[PDB]
Amino acid sequence: RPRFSFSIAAREGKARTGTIEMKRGVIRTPAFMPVGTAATVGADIILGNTYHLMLRPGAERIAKLGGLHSFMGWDRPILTDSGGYQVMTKQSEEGVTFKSHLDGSRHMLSPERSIEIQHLLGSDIVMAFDECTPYPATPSRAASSMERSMRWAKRSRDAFDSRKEQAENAALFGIQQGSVFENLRQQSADALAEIGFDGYAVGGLAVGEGQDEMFRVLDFSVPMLPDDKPHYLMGVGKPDDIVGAVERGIDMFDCVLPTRSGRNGQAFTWDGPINIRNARFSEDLKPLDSECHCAVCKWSRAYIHHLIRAGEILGAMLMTEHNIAFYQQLMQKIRDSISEGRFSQFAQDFRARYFA
């Protein structure tokens, strides 16, 4: 396999389905990328949590232990974020400084240090070091923030290219910013394409703007990115957010929801989310989702309800496994429907059932 090759196998409207080939494995797109620590080692790529890892146990320590693949027992691709979003504290053109709440140790984050940390973690897809602009933002502040992120994007590119093992075996994604403003999104896309990256992320969304505004921003933002490269929407999202983002040309997704909801009693089903702790499930013998193929859907809603209400860790684990599996089944149905030219119909059918 090559270091990085993205090929589009089928299209329907703005939606695409295809593959990213990397040395450690093939990623089927559109892809959902789950938190790597969420369950036992389906997903083609998992996330490492750069910000958490640089605090505990530290990037150098992870490298001493053989890198994240050996550490987590996962030999397929891993994507890491650049760490600044999670941090953001004192910011400047050099980077961000912050104090660890874990032990008071001081940490600097800069484009160069972010790339170095991700190199030490051994991730396969490295994110440029950006500034996630807060929402809402004025045009002036969004522009200043986006401009700093583009200078940091070039510094991330150079730092990545200066590490031969990283340049030859990993891939680097640039991150578009610009808040909700079309002209800043265009300026950011042009700056990123002039630098050149392996894939392009749409950053600065899933920050509280709501689905309508998010879709409006995707409508003009995704076409600004190189069509022949993967498009990664960071932090998105609920199942209906994912369907609509694929309809707007997104290829890759991550979201805290499947694992967070799995810890707070919420299960995703084709009939929408349910809170399994509710008394209405105490005698419900149907599996979590009727059509779900996951291992949990052996276990009834009644039993999972019981486990969670009883405080048993098994309950939260089964809920999390189901949610992660549901997201991957969603992505499989998206990929198959695009490939078969029936994605528009799938999206309509999905939304009628999910919101009924």
Ligand X SMILES: Nc1nc2c(CCc3ccccc3)c3nc[nH]c3cc2c(=O)[nH]1
Q: Where are the alpha helices (DSSP H) in 24-138?
A: 50-55, 59-64, 67-72, 84-87, 111-121
- Residue 341's binding partner among ligand X, Zn ion, a second copy, none (Cβ under 5 to 8 angstroms by kind) is none
The residue with its CB nearest to ligand X is: 235
Rounded (10°) angle between helices 111-121 and 139-161: 50
Judged by DSSP in three states, 32 sits in strand
Using the structure block, give the residue that is written with the tokens 């749409």: 202
Question: Binding partner of residue 292 among ligand X, Zn ion, a second copy, none, CB under 5 to 8 Å per kind?
Answer: Zn ion
Cross-strand bridge partners of residue 29: 18
Q: How many CB atoms lie within 10 A of CB 190?
A: 12
Site string for Zn ion, 269-288 (x = CB under 5 A): -------------------x
What residue type is assigned to position 291 of the chain? E
Q: How far apart are CA 206 and CA 36, in angstroms?
A: 20
Question: Using CA atoms, how far apart are residues 265 and 267, in angstroms rounded to an integer?
Answer: 7
Smallest gap from Cβ 248 to ligand X, in A, equals: 16
Contact flag: residue 294 with Zn ion (CB under 5 A): yes
Minimal distance, residue 259 CB to a second copy, in Å:
9
Residues near 222 by beta carbon (within 8 Å), at least 6 away in sequence? 14, 202, 231, 248, 249, 250
**DSSP label of 241:** H
251 is in an annotated binding site: no
Stretch of residues binding Zn ion (CB under 5 A), selected from 14-22, 42-50, 289-297, 332-340? 289-297
Instruction: Please pick, among 44, 81, 198, 251, the residue that the annotation labels catalytic.
Output: 81
Told to check if 282 binds a second copy by CB under 8 A, we report yes
Q: Which does 206 bind (CB under 5 to 8 A by kind): ligand X, a second copy, Zn ion, none?
A: ligand X
Decide whether 80 or 329 has the Cβ nearer to Zn ion: 329
- Which part of the chain contacts a second copy (CB under 8 A), choosing from 24-32, 63-71, 133-141, 338-346? 63-71
Contact predicate 291/322, CB 8 Å: no
User: What is the Rg, in whole angstroms, of the alpha carbon atoms belonging to the chain?
Assistant: 20
Question: Hey, what are 323's tokens?
Answer: 């949610």
254 is known as an active-site residue: yes
Residue 74 CA to residue 78 CA, distance in Å, equals: 8
Q: How far is the CB of 128 from ligand X (least distance, A)?
A: 8
Do the annotations mark residue 322 as ligand-binding?
yes
Distances (CA, A) of 175 to 132, 190, 265: 9, 12, 33
Closer to ligand X by Cβ: residue 81 or 112: 81
Consult the annotation and say whether 174 binds a ligand.
Answer: no
Q: Assess whether 284 carries a catalytic annotation.
A: no
CB nearer to Zn ion: give 172 or 297. Answer: 297
Find, among 229, 112, 100, 195, the residue nearest to 160 by Cα. 112
Tell me if 82 is assigned to a ligand binding site: yes
Residue among 263, 252, 265 at smallest CA distance from 334:
252
- Find out whether 196 is annotated in a ligand binding site: no
Catalytic residue among 124, 241, 254, 289: 254
User: What is d(CA 227, CA 224) in angstroms, rounded to the nearest whole number?
Assistant: 8
Whether 204 has a binding-site annotation, put simply, is yes
Q: Which residues bind ligand X (CB under 6 A)?
A: 47, 49, 79, 81-82, 85, 127, 130, 132, 175, 203-204, 206-207, 234-235, 254
Tell me if 296 contacts Zn ion by CB under 5 A: yes
| Binding-site residue set for Zn(2+) | 292, 294, 297, 322
| Binding-site residue set | 81-85, 130, 177, 204, 292, 294, 297, 322
Q: Which residues bind a second copy (CB under 8 A)?
A: 37-41, 52, 56-57, 61, 64-66, 71-73, 263, 282-283, 285, 298-300, 302-303, 306-307, 309-310, 312-314, 316-318, 320
Which residues are annotated as catalytic?
Answer: 81, 254
